[PDB]
Each structure stands twice: as C-alpha cells, then as structure tokens.
From a paper:
The core motif of KpFlo11A, the FNIII domain, showed the highest degree of similarity (0.70 Å for 61 Cα atoms derived from the β-sheet), whereas the neck-like subdomain and the apical regions deviated from ScFlo11A. The surface of KpFlo11A exposed 6 tryptophans and nine tyrosines that cluster in two bands, which were similar but not identical to the aromatic bands of ScFlo11A. To test, whether KpFlo11A can also establish homophilic interactions, we performed SPR analysis. Similar to ScFlo11A, KpFlo11A is able to undergo homophilic interactions with a KD of 31.8 µM. Similarly, KpFlo11A enabled efficient cell aggregation at the population level.
The structural and mutational analysis of different Flo11A domains demonstrates that homotypic Flo11A-Flo11A interactions depend on evolutionary conserved aromatic residues, which form two bands at the Flo11A surface.
Numbering used by the authors: 13 to 20, 25 to 192
C-alpha cells in the first residue's frame, strides 16, 4: 500500500555532476568567480532542476542593483532573477556566495550516458538605480559585467567563456 503513489524526481549521483568540457585557458576578465552546478534532479523528458553555485569577489548587498541569469534555455523562462531592486526579487543574503535552483532544458552530451544544459550568462549590476553608492569609488572593476557560461566559443583548447556548463547522467541514472 504505502509504496503505491496516489496518482500520476530522481536525484543524480553527485559525483556524476561535473564540467561538460575542459580548456587550457578560460576568459579571465572581471572579478574572479567560481560558478558550477552541484546537483541535478530529473523532472521529465529533457527537463531537470539543478543547483547552481556562485562565488565571486563582490561589493556589498546594498550596492547591488541587479543579479540575474540570462539566456537560459528553460521551460520556465530565459531569465532567473536572484536580486533585483527594480523587479522586487530578493533571494540571496550575500552577493559573493549563493546558490539558486534553475529549471533547465538539456541535450545529449558527447558521451550519451550524459546530458548537459545550454550556455547562459550571469549579469551583475552595481551602484546604480537606487543602490547604495558607498564603497563604489574604491571598486576596481566595471559597475556592470557578465560571466559567460559555456562549452562553445572554444578554439584550440582556449575558451572565450569564463566557465564550462555542466553535464550529469541522463534521467539522473546510475548506469554511467
Ligand atoms: Na543565500
């Protein structure tokens, strides 16, 4: 009885979530960052829910105008906001380190035991449009910039992106 559902996901082995490509060099513009997927769950067909982890050198939360994922290939929208003064979304405590859930479309990876998500960007905007300007004049970097995530735009082992996208087993299976 207890094992039968009442009507009409699989989490991926964490060790099997890893980068979908490697390179000798990656783009090094903007503050240093560490951006990766840390878990995946199969929803249905080519749709998964993933945990994106972000760490980067930053200003303070009060300086932050907007922080969002853009260009996302997803059934629930091309944009996910993590912080937006203008749209009133307040989902993180610290801009330097946070996770977020993303629902994403996938495609078959080179090794077809795995699937991978599509390229996307993380746009960061500081010190404008109602954000505090305190400490913004000591900031060495631009006030607005984008981390580019992808396994595309790679020539002879050099990527023009900041970080790879991630792959994980198809259906979050344990076969791989
Ligand atoms: Na948080």
């Amino acid at each position: 009885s207890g094992l039968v559902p009442r009507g009409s996901g699989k989490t991926c082995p964490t060790s099997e979530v890893s980068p979908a490509c490697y390179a000798n060099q990656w783009e090094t513009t903007f503050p240093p960052s560490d951006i990766k997927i840390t878990g995946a769950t199969w929803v249905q067909d080519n749709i998964y829910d993933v945990t994106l982890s972000y760490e980067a050198e930053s200003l303070e939360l009060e300086n932050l105008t907007e922080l969002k994922i853009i260009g996302l290939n997803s059934p629930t929208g091309g944009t996910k906001l993590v912080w937006s003064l203008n749209s009133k979304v307040y989902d993180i405590d610290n801009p330097a380190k946070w996770t977020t859930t993303l629902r994403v479309y996938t495609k078959s990876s080179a090794d077809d035991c795995y699937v991978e998500m599509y390229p996307f960007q993380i746009q960061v905007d500081w010190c404008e449009a109602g954000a505090s300007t305190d400490g913004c004049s000591a900031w060495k970097w631009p006030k607005s910039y984008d981390y580019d995530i992808g396994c595309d735009n790679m020539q002879d082992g050099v990527s023009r992106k900041h970080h790879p996208v991630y792959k994980w087993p198809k259906k979050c299976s344990s076969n791989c």
